[PDB]
Symmetry: C2
Subunit: 307 residues, 2 copies
């Protein structure tokens, strides 16, 4: 039905809700190009188990933020400015409504991340799938060479700032399920999408000297925080300097899991960390609150190793 | 565990793809500090392999399709006059056999070698029961850079302009569902006129036209290019051609692989149909002036391509043969 696809195409006045000036516009901007000091490109892609909730709940308008989230947060942590987004939706038989729903959510993370949805595609893959689909994302960011923050300016004792997560985000969702497969509202919280920190960082970097940043994905703080730390340097979190979610405290009891254990799977209520010079932590903490983020002095840098 | 340090070592297929421009390594980096463009523009694109993959599950050959994935992305780039810089892959599977995944990036690297782009990143997803054991998926994503003045869209193509076609490796990457439909209706893999084992003919990877296409452009005026993919000639030649301009194709100007013949004989297809699905031996078309047409043909063949004056531009609409 090429008619239904007609009115399915016009439906993407969604993508334009992501558009930026730089887009030498194709469709609504779909298919177009991106117009471009000492320019360096930063790219990323991200295909998680968090999709399982969506298949069941049959609710797909927010799963595409997480995606955008998991791509763009990792580019901006290198102080790069996200420009455009490409999506790949592997599909049994495209449910014209489902597709549109999922791209309704992609264009919402794109708006927030402040990048254009210049392209993407729905794959009719007859056989692999029945209520399922896979969602992939691709991103390109830009940075000035001498401005890349790659935390080698991380000196012992810097104040560590932690920006507030909305819940699980995109990781741990297999342990979540087993824990509450071992057990028995739940789903609205677990369908909570991953926060995007792109805009507030950018205006942060525009104002302050950011020593280093990290995105709390991987295996919790322990994987990710040291990740930014330089040799002979460390990171000590003052437990109780931020508000941890009922979700996390919840899985802590239910599965009866260990603290240090959970800290290596789950964000434990904190989505991102940037290292800051003790004399500035105050007003930049202020600045981010000014950005609608939950900033807090989570701990500090030390000379050593780990968390 | 111990098998991953080694599987991350054999990942050296990327080393074979690298350019000076690629900057050291949460998101690969490419330097644009020496490109000497004055109105620089980024042209990107993503595509997923498709129905061809089903035949790579059958033959258990996984190191070439990645050339298929790259080729589609990259040919769609240079055809607008850009230069592919870097590529990112996304592979989806139930779970990953480090080897099998190694063969996929192995043909992704190669394809990237030929396209001349860096393999700067990629994801590998061991998925639940969403994917079976044999069954996997493969999407790619490219970025190319062009100067705002050097873009080609076809609007400048005119009546009496000369269409050259660059030959293809065979089916490339389009029409395989209809191919399979007579695999069913037919009988499976050496058939008829000049021939390899049938499956082996079918799994021939898509041609990558990048390196020649940029050399062209460095030496001559190109008014259009069409990547003959989905919808074959009937879909893709029209789309480069402005209003009032149609196309005349001279059926004997190029070589049609026997598999297209087979498919038509065996499948009882019409020629119009065939040309609305299959490339029929020509993977990419480029409108040219008449006065250059013959130089261009040799520049391309000096490039290592097979290039034929395939037809011409007229007043009208769509495509017409003779």
């Amino acid at each position: 039905i090429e008619a239904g696809y007609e009115a399915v195409s016009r439906m993407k006045k969604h993508v334009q809700t992501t558009m930026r000036k730089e887009v030498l516009g194709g469709l609504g901007g779909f298919g177009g190009m991106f117009d471009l000091e000492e320019p360096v490109l930063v790219s990323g892609t991200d295909g998680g188990t968090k999709l399982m909730l969506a298949f069941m709940a049959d609710k797909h308008d927010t799963i595409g933020i997480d995606a955008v989230a998991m791509c763009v947060n990792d580019i901006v942590v290198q102080g790069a400015e996200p420009l455009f987004f490409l999506d790949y939706i592997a599909c049994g038989k495209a449910e014209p409504s489902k597709i549109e729903n999922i791209v309704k959510g992609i264009s919402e993370g794109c708006r927030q991340a402040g990048c254009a949805l210049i392209g993407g595609e729905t794959a009719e893959m007859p056989g692999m799938y029945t209520e399922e689909y896979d969602l992939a994302g691709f991103t390109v960011g830009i940075v000035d060479k001498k401005k890349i923050v790659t935390g080698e300016k991380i000196e012992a004792g810097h104040v560590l700032i932690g920006l507030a997560s909305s819940g699980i985000h995109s990781n741990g969702y297999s342990l979540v399920r087993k824990v509450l497969l071992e057990d028995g509202p739940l789903g609205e919280e677990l369908l909570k999408p991953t926060k995007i920190y792109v805009k507030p960082i950018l205006e942060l970097l525009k104002n302050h000297e950011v020593y280093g940043m990290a995105h709390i994905t991987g295996g919790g703080f322990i994987e990710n925080i040291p990740r930014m730390l330089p040799e002979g340097i460390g990171a000590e979190i003052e437990l109780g300097s931020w508000k941890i979610q009922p979700i996390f405290s919840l899985l802590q009891e239910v599965g009866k899991l260990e603290e240090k254990e959970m800290f290596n799977i789950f964000n434990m209520g904190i989505g991102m960390v940037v290292a800051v010079k003790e004399e500035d932590a105050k007003d930049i903490v202020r600045l981010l609150e000014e950005q609608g983020e939950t900033a807090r002095i989570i701990g500090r840098t030390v000379q050593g190793a780990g968390v």
